Amino acid sequence: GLRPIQVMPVNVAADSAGMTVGTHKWWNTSSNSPGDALLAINDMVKGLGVKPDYFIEANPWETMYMKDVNSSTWPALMTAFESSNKAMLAWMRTNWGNPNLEIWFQGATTVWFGVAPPNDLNSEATVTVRDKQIQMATANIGFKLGSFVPGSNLYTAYRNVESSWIYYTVEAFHATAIELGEALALNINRATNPPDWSYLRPPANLQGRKLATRDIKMTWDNRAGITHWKYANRHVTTGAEISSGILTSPEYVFTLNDQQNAYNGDTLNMSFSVSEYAADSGAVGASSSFVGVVQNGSYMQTPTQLKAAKQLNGDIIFTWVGRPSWQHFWVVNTSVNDSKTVIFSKEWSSESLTWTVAEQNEFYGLEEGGATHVIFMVSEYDPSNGLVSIGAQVTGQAEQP
Amino acid sequence: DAEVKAAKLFTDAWVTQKTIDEGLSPPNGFTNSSLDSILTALKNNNALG
Amino acid sequence: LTTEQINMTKEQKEAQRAQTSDTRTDGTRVAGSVGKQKELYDQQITSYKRDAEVKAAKLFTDAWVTQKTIDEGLSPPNGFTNSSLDSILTALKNNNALG
Amino acid sequence: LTTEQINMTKEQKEAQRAQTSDTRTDGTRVAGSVGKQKELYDQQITSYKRDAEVKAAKLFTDAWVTQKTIDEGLSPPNGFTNSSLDSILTALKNNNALG
């Protein structure tokens, strides 16, 4: 309700400054005192003539600093972040003359890289910072949560550069300012009701396995209360997005046909990202990205000379040649009426396997003669690690006796 | 159109084997059941039935 | 009417910008008729490259079939095995909505 | 309206600059419709050169198959061996998304 002239904002930002670490020091950790960056502006603040009323904090440089360092130092920085902010608030609570000076926090932001970019490691790092300022604004007096940048979990809200997306858009600041200004005037704190994507968390682990077939399957652990996930598969080198969607199961498969569309052949490298998706509201949380080389057992030897023979009685015997010193072969059997139903999948310790006609009639529901066409796959197996080498496939009919 | 003409070479190399090596088991994709799905689709696609 | 001609001039500028540039004035990628036309060229370019490979492979496979019919008993290449053809056959049914 | 015509004149200049030059006024490479058109010519030029080679090779391989059918027992060239054909067969499946 006040006049627009009666409100006067000022700029006190310092380039890449941090209360604990940064190019410009805002607070001193050796002894509790303002840093050189903060000491360079305290003179003009006192000479302004009006005591400060609201202090706005947007994004400490510690979030960018923790991107490179190991995760073991992350809890250490959080302790220093809390101590410095509490000490800084008490210093200017009395020096600047405002007995009810308040600090308002703005939600932390992540970093992207490229066109249709996957979220960088800052997504896993800013969450700790994000899950740090919330309790400072709801379990403590003196610190408040101002607002969040709209579309923070979305890459489009930043869009400031073609690669290494860091800064925001022109409309992002205006969108943030109107929400931030409303909280200041109405004294409403955002820490009471964090947004939906705040509760969503990135998956703990993300890795890919190449099966006996040249396809690659992505695996990540499930979370209680989560039923959907959103994935994003992109080109390894050019970075162009390949496929994306919503997954109701915490697994994804990269078939051979898709690989032969993006490239001229199947590849071992992969750049994959996935995040938990809330189907009730459509909110998207932090995304975990996996790049490099998928898990594989290419150091092993593939089986060779796969032949299938049907005997006079009716049973089918499968034979192959391989490495006797590594006599461990995982065998997968598939039906012919549908090419996806598994007959059996077991570890084998011989170069030959017999499929008795008794169970052939059992699986297909037949009464006599067994199966004539059988889908068979054998691959050298490693009991120590569980890795599966590229196996040789013999499919369908067996040779007549 | 590029895929079908490419597949011509592979199936050509098989039919020449069948006529000279009679007794070779045809692939499961050429079985009686497999062709039925294609035949039913063609009648439905072209409003033949 | 002068105000209306402002919008037409801006739109005709985008049509000119469609050439020599893949992004509009605001920065978004062109996706209209010109954008669809470019995609057709990309498919045609790949088609021409793919068409040269298949006809080149005709000579090599021709030299093999003539050997098989006169030198019966020669072992066919693993690429012509029963299992190898199954992947191609399954793809064709799925690609052409046959199944 | 005069201000709007400034942008159109600049954009039409780029279309003119697309000819006789591969870079715009600012120096970036042209990538629009004209840029895509040039790439199609490059593929076609290679296609014409490649098409002349394959038909020329037809005569040489024709003179060999006629020898094999009448002089059975002649050893086929190493380029027609079982191992040599496998690389071609694997490429065709990967190029056409058959596998």
From TrEMBL, chains C, D:
Location of region: Disordered: 9-32
Superkingdom classification of source: Viruses
Name of the protein described by the UniProt record: Gp54
Record organism: Enterobacteria phage N4 (Bacteriophage N4)
Full-protein residues shown: 201 to 299 of 299
